[PDB]
Amino acid sequence: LTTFSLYTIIVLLVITSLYTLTNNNNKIIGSRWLISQEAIYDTIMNMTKGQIGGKNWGLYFPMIFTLFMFIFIANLISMIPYSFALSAHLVFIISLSIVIWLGNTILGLYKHGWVFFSLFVPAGTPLPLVPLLVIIETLSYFARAISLGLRLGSNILAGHLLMVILAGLTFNFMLINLFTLVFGFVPLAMILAIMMLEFAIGIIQGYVWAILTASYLKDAVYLH
């Protein structure tokens, strides 16, 4: 068995129930849980309608929605204190970032020919720095390749690892001098604040992913 494979199965079954058994009545008033995924739907609909701004704005709305939801669900499931992190296999998240970067490069080449690199010519400037402004645009174009993945990876990895080291320390803090285990609630509360923060930065990252790879698609769909 593959631990990663088992938790991907759990994610899939959660998502199937979230858009079937969420308003199985099919109310025109809408069941209360499905109101959340309506508001999310609208703030990403109207965001990727703004950003992408092409005719393919709504055509890339499902991809950007499953890029929201993937990170949103995998940063809830990975936050369960007896659940195996998909994100601890960083290689899937980073691989997805490189795949999207390459699928942007191919999209850009397809959409804007071999004059796609005119994206990295930004403006007229004095002649000795016209090539320079191509170099430090292209460097940022594949700094865009790795930055997006490593941001999300760093937040999630650091949160789980931070919590575990501090938990083990406060465990052995409680084991030593038992009078500190009495009123050992304040370090538990410090870990609680961190756990609240790790949910926050996990929900922030699913949206932040989806705005940043909307900005990258803004460049790719229409040159500049």
Binding site: N155, A158, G159, L161, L162, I204
Partner: protein
């Protein structure tokens, strides 16, 4: 081996330095908040969620420093 164990304890202290930036960062957001709210009064309904977001992001960079500190210190 005494060198490597000593290196752990030194390296921890070096890593701790990174935290200072986040500490100043939190304050910068809150200083802006206080000034801004004084200008408008009622802008706060929009702005207060933005302040929490700003705090979280500045803090997160700080946490990266802290986990490296603990990796060297504790293991």
């Amino acid at each position: 081996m005494q060198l490597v164990l000593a290196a752990k304890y030194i390296g921890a202290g070096i890593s701790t330095i990174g935290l200072l930036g986040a500490g100043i960062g939190i304050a910068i957001v809150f200083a802006a908040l206080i000034n801004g709210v004084s200008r408008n009064p009622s802008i706060k309904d929009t702005v207060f969620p933005m302040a929490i977001l700003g705090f979280a992001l500045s803090e997160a960079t700080g946490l990266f420093c802290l986990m490296v500190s603990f990796l060297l210190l504790f293991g």
